[PDB]
Each structure stands twice: as C-alpha cells, then as structure tokens.
Design an enzyme around this catalytic site. Structure first.
Site: not given
Lengths: 52, 337, 171, 120, 164
Positions: B180, B204-207
């Site tokens: 992110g 954000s790639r923790v979604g």
C-alpha cells in the site's frame, strides 16, 4: 373536494398529539438545566484540582 | 507525501480514533500506539505531547524520541530500538501500531554515519544497504500466526517527499517493501482540502480483509464515483452534456464530504451512514454550504430517531437488508428536512 | 423515548406537505428538536458526579482543600432547584389547542359525509335531456331576475352565451 | 400549412388561416391558397392555427405560398404585443431628427412602424 | 485572415474587402450592411453571377469549404416558373427579392462558416494541447537523461576523492 376534506379529518386529531408531545419534551428539557449545573460544577472542580 | 503538510497530523488522527478502540476490552483492539519521533525538534514533539494529553491518548502512547539535535547514531537505531518494544506487545499477542516519522531523515542519519565511517556512498548519495536496513525494519510489522499468537504489530511509515519525487531512491525502495501507499496530494492541500490525498495515487494491497464488511458494501460505489468525478473534471474546465454535469454534482458533494477538520476522528458506525447517503446521491440536492451542517445533523437525527440503528450497524458489522431498509427510510426523512 | 416524539414530527412534516400555512411552526418544531438534542448531548457529556478524591486527594500532598472542595460540592449538593414549573402554561396551551382541534375535526367530519351525500345526490338525480326551463326557474328565481333585468337593460345578448354556444346566425 | 421562420427562431415552421400585410395591401391565406410570392410589407400579422390566434409584429420579408401549400414566411424577426408608450415618445424624437436628411428616411420608417404598432 | 491569404495570390482582384466582422457571431445588421455596400459599391447586380464561399460545417469534427451562387435579379426574371408564384408588375419582385436574398443567403453562409470555424477552433486547440503533451514528454526524457548524467559525474568525483 372529497380528497381535500379527507386529509383534514385525519389531521385534526393527530396534530393535537404532536402539539402536546412537543411542549412536553421542552418541559423535560428545562430539568436538564439543573443537570447542566451539576455537570458544570464538576468540570470546574477537576480544573482547580488539576492546578493543585 | 509532502513535507510537514500536517504529515504528522494525518497519522495523529488514527491514534485518536484508536483511543475509542483502546477503551474496548478486547485486547486485539488495544493497540498500544507508538510514535517514533525521528529528528523532530523538541518543540514539535511538545505539540504532539500536549495534543496527546488533551485527547487523553497518553495512557497507551509511547514516544521514542530521537530529537533533531540528538546524535545520528541514536537516530539510526531509533526505529530498530522502537521495533523491539513493539515485538514485546506483538509477541504477547497484543496489537499495536508503530508510526515511523520520518524514515527519510532516518536515511540521512545513516548516510551521515556511513560517510563518517567512510563507508562508500551509493545511488542518490545514499548508502546501498539502506535498502537492506529499511527492509529489516519493515519485516517486524507482521500479523503473527495463532500458534505464535494472534497478535501483530502494524506500522505506517511516513516518508517525506521532496516535491512529490517518489522516484527518489529511498521512496522507491520502501514502496516495493510495503504493501500500500498513501500519497497525500499537495495541490489538494494547497487548495485547502484537509485531509489532502489523491486516491488515484493511494492504494492498499491488504484490501477488504482489512475492510469492515458493511463499509465494503457501501464503498465500491464510492471509489467508482470519485474516479468518474476526477475523469470528468476536465469536461467542466467547457459547455458540455447534462450527463457530465450529473457526475460532477455527485462527485462534488462526495469531495466535500470527505473533508474533515483535523483532530476529529469518527466511529465506523457513523462513517457508514454518511457514505450511504452520498452513495445514494441524496446529498446532491443539499447545497455545498449545507453539506457540513447536514452531516452532524443527520448523525444527531440518527441518535434521536434510532441510536439503536447505529448500535445495530456496529454490532452486526454487516448491513442487513433490514438495516438498509430502515436506513433508506431514515436518510430520506432527514434529507427531506 | 425520543422516537415517539419524532415519529409524530416527521409524519407531521409530510402532513404539512399536504397543508402549508406554517411560518414559524416548523421553526418551533426545529426548536423542540434542538433542545432535545442539546439535553442529550448534555447528558452524554455529563461529568463525574463528585471529585475523585480517592485518587486525587491521595495524589495530593496539598490535602484538605480536596476535602474543602469535596465538602463544597456536598454543600452545594442543591446545585439548583426544580425547573419543572410548567403545569399551568402547558395546560393553557393544551386547552386552546384541544378547542381548535375538536372544532376542526367536527367540521370536517360533517363535511365528509355531506360530500358523500352530495355525490350520491348528483348521481341519483340528474336530467340528461328533458327538463323544463320552468324546473330551472323553480330551482333558481335568479334565472327570472336576470332575464327581467336584462330585458330592462336592453341587452339581449347574454355574455358568455357565444363562447360555449357558438353563434348560429344567417350572417 | 405555414412555415414561418426567422434567422433567430422558427415560429410556425395545419395553421389554418394567416393574415398578412403585403405590398398588395393585406392578403389572407387559408388551407390551399394559390402559390404566389408577395413581398411582405412591415406588418401586424395574425396567425391562426385552428381557432387560436397569435399576433406577430413582423419586420417585413417575403411570403411565398409554395405549390405544396407551404406558406414560407421569411422575416428577420417578429407576437409583437409583449414589447409595448416611451417608444412613441422617442419616435417623436426620431421624427424631429427627420429634419436631418438617409437619416430622415430611416426616421420616417420609424414613424411608420410606431403608427403600425400603435394601432394594436 | 481570409483577406491575407487571397491578397497574396491576387491583390488587384481585392477591390472591396470588409474588416471588423470576425469578432462577433453573424448578425443581420452586418449581413444587411455588407449587402448594401456590395450593391452600392460593387453594383453586383451587373456581375454575371455572384458566388460566395464559406465553410460548410460537414460534421462537428470537419469543415468542407463550400460555395453557392446568389441568384441575381436577372435569374429571377428568366426563371420559367414564376407565374405559379404570381405577382404584379408593380412592386417588382426581382428588384426586392435579389436584395432580400442577398442578405438572407449571405447571413446563412456567414452562420455556417462561423459555426465551422469555432468548431474547428475547439478541435484544433485540443489537438494542439495533445501535440504539446508529446513534446513535454520528449523533453522530459532528455531532462531525465541529463539529470542522470550529472549524478554519474558526481559519484565519480566522490570516489576519486575517497581513493586519495
């Protein structure tokens, strides 16, 4: 004309309910002022105390 | 994002909302926040300290302080030292949030040190094993397996951009390591939008395994609408179609809504209603000046009419058909007045 | 709780949609909401009742002034007397209101059934073709009055006759 | 049919009877009327489509009943009644300005127009 | 602008020219006066034909220059169907109709031209912005290369120093 009248019939009773309720709530809200003085006194007390 | 644009202020807001969660007895919701003041003048940290005392946030706070005057070796080891404290909470199964502010100056201190040890410079006259350093620090923020305890350390490093140059060696490295980025957009800041963020450049790639289910439902739309507002911005910069103008209004009200004077946090059960209204474009009618007024009024209205609904939203954590039903009615009634 | 009040309020707002004479009536309702929310935020704001002289007097080495304000709070335990006093004024309003309400209600109920009857009367009696002009004169002597004055005036054109009974004339 | 049009707005692009003032005096056109060209004199015009009657004040132009029974009325601008006493007073000023000689002729057309308007 | 382009190709042919029109959108006042001057000055009724050129706005992405002929009074006279447009000798329709269609045709031509022109202006200025973008990007790469080169020489300098 019938349509107009029918609105008025239902209104006449129900409005009297809100009338009472609204002023009643306001009366309760008066007593909240005494609450305010309790709240106030405490806030002041903590401040003086903090200074000590 | 850009230097001292209330960079610290954006971070501090999270801590304040976390005061609410902290009060909560669930000890995974007891995030024992750590602010790591790296090369920050004692005056700046003094402001922070007083703000923390004011919002009563001092009682879980830790401020590891490596001040502006303090030696570059202390500055260098300061997030590492801090991280070990964080491990104690994390390992104990607790959760906590560590905010490294700012690793850019941490980088400079390591540079100073390395040069003084005559250890060679590298790209952008920063040491080459600065990458190695940063990666070590950032691998201590982790959601631990349940055999190793549920606990975690969460981290949000703050990187100060030299005119938004994320091409810079220290930014590029960190961006890859972290998952992110939030890219605060300075033009927006200058144009008085606080918070100042472009979410075209925030990801954000923790979604949505880090998003509340309720909030997910009512914010797929939100992402899309604002995207359109951005794209169709230039169609306003010309006498053009009603369709564009519809988008623009819906966008403008949303844009206005996501403003928020700093050091006011919000409960999620009040995030969701405001977003619901906007999503449904019921704020389109509400003129811009009355948007601000509407929010608080709607919230107080929700408390008077049904603070049960707010509590219910909170506890279900998912907006039920019944909650969306009641909510649609309620929003309409408030909007009407 | 407050929701009973509010359920009538918004219902009255959508009823006021149907009938609007309001000027400051909505502003009074707004006011009643205002103070209702003010007391609620007051009551949620509410400070601890008394000095926490458990912790903070045992914090203090400057004792006996925490005991002073402890005793001052307990002295000032009457923080202010009753603010329920309305019981005359609330009744004054209620009587006038009730009078107006009942008067209106009774009038419109009468009119409603009268209208049902009126609809029935036009429906069950109505000539379609045949009808003596004398039956109309019998229903209105206004007819003969208008005819006699019109003849006296020397206006043998009746205004409006043309504009819905188009001219038929040789010319 | 009528096809009253202007390079400003299209007024009445069946319009049963139209009454027009032409250099041939006044001409009225009804349904199928013979296909003519008439230069429209500056005018007070009535346009009737069925019984309803609408009252143009028209800057003069051309009228052409076409053989497809389309009364092409072409005029620069045209009902007149909403526009309407100071115009008669300033028109008297323009009449005094007719002392000044093309300018006299212009002012004369202005006087003609006031008279034409004043009638309604 | 059209004055300039033609004035180069034939300057003698330019006899009367009109300036101070372009700023405003086409208007009857202008067309009428230009027509009036065209009749008085150039006595254009004696010119075998009139032709007017303008820009037909084919599509709001295109403009095709187009022309049409303004039918003179002689044409009106000698047109065969004109009796199925019956009119009297008195108030000779050619002598009014010529002048009337001088303006009406001219004004319409003017409207078509200006509509094409402003449409084209939007299109062109948009394409200009795009072309400028490409040039921005081309100089950006050069900037980046030059920036990089400065860094390289500086690094060499530090190393050269350190080695001593």
């Amino acid at each position: 004309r019938i349509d107009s009248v029918s609105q008025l019939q239902n209104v006449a009773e129900t409005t009297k309910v809100l009338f009472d309720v609204s002023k009643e709530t306001v009366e309760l809200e008066s007593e909240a002022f005494e609450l305010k003085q309790k709240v106030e006194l405490a806030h002041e007390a903590k401040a003086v105390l903090d200074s000590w | 994002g850009d230097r001292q644009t209330g960079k610290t202020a954006v971070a501090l807001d999270t801590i304040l909302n976390q005061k609410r969660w902290n009060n909560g007895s669930d000890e995974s919701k007891k995030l024992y926040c750590v602010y790591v003041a790296v090369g920050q003048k004692r005056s700046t940290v003094a402001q922070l300290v007083q703000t923390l005392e004011q919002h009563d946030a001092m009682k879980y706070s830790i401020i590891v302080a490596a001040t502006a005057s303090e030696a570059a070796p202390l500055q260098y080891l300061a997030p590492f030292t801090a991280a070990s404290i964080g491990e104690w909470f994390r390992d104990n199964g607790k959760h906590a949030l560590i905010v490294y502010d700012d690793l850019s100056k941490q980088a400079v201190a390591y540079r100073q040190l390395s040069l003084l040890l005559r250890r060679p410079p590298g790209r952008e006259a920063y040491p080459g094993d600065v990458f190695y350093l940063h990666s070590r620090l950032l691998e201590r923020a982790a959601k631990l397996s349940e055999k190793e305890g549920s606990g975690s350390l969460t981290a949000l490093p703050v990187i100060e951009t030299q005119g938004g140059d994320v091409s810079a060696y220290i930014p590029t490295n960190v961006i890859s390591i972290t998952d992110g980025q939030i890219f605060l957009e300075a033009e927006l800041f200058y144009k008085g939008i606080r918070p100042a963020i472009n979410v075209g450049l925030s990801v954000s790639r923790v979604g949505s395994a880090a998003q509340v289910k309720a909030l997910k439902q009512v914010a797929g739309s939100l992402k899309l609408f604002l995207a359109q507002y951005r794209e169709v911005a230039a169609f306003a910069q010309s006498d053009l179609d009603a369709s564009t103008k519809q988008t623009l209004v819906r966008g403008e009200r949303l844009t206005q809504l996501l403003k928020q004077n700093q050091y006011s946090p919000l409960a999620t059960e009040e995030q969701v209603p405001l977003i619901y209204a906007g999503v449904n474009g019921h704020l389109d009618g509400i003129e811009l000046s009355r948007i601000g007024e509407f929010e608080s009024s709607f919230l107080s209205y929700l408390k008077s009419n049904h603070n049960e609904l707010l509590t219910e939203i909170r506890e279900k954590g998912e907006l039920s058909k019944e909650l969306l039903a009641s909510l649609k009615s309620a929003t309409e009634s408030f909007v009407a007045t | 709780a407050k929701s009973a009040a509010n359920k009538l309020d918004w219902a009255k707002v959508i009823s006021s949609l149907r009938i609007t004479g309001s000027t400051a009536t909505q502003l009074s309702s707004f006011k009643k909401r205002n103070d209702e929310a003010r007391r609620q935020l007051l009551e949620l704001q509410s400070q601890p009742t008394e000095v926490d002289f458990s912790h903070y007097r045992s914090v203090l080495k400057n004792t006996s002034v925490i005991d002073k304000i402890e005793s001052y709070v307990k002295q000032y335990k009457p923080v202010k007397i009753d603010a329920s006093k309305q019981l005359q004024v609330i009744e004054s309003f209620e009587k006038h209101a009730m009078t107006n309400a009942k008067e209106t209600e009774s009038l419109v109920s009468k009119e409603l059934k009268d209208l049902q009857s009126t609809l029935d009367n036009i429906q069950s009696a109505r000539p379609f073709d045949e009808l003596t002009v004398d039956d109309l004169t019998k229903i209105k002597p206004e007819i003969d009055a208008k005819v006699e004055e019109m003849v006296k005036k020397g206006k043998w054109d009746v205004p409006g006759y043309k504009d819905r009974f188009g001219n038929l004339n040789v010319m | 049919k009528l096809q009253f049009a202007l390079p400003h707005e299209t007024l009445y692009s069946e319009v049963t009877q139209v009454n027009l003032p032409a250099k041939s005096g006044r001409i009225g056109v009804l349904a199928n009327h013979v296909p003519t060209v008439e230069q429209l004199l500056p005018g007070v015009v009535e346009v009737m489509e069925g019984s309803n009657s609408k009252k143009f004040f028209i800057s003069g132009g051309f009228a052409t009943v076409q053989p497809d029974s389309q009364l092409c009325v072409t005029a620069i601008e045209a009902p007149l009644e909403s526009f309407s006493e100071n115009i008669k007073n300033l028109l008297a000023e323009a009449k005094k300005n007719v002392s000044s000689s093309r300018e006299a002729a212009e002012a004369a057309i202005q006087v003609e127009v006031l008279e034409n308007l004043q009638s309604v | 602008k059209i004055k300039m382009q033609l004035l180069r190709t034939h300057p003698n042919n330019i006899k009367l020219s009109i300036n101070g029109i372009g700023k405003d959108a086409p208007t009857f006042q202008e067309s009428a006066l230009i027509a009036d001057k065209l009749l008085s000055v150039m006595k254009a009724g004696t010119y075998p034909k009139i032709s007017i050129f303008y820009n037909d706005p084919v599509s709001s992405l295109s403009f095709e220059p187009s022309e049409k002929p303004i039918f003179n009074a002689k044409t009106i006279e000698q047109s065969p169907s004109f009796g199925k447009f019956e009119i009297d000798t008195d108030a000779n329709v050619p002598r009014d109709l010529f002048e009337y269609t001088l303006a009406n045709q001219m004004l319409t031509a003017m409207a078509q031209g200006y509509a094409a022109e402003i449409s084209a202006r939007r299109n062109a200025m948009d394409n200009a912005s795009k072309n400028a973008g490409d040039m921005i990007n081309r100089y950006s790469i050069l900037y980046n290369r030059t920036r990089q080169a400065v860094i390289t020489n500086e690094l060499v300098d530090i190393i050269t120093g350190a080695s001593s």
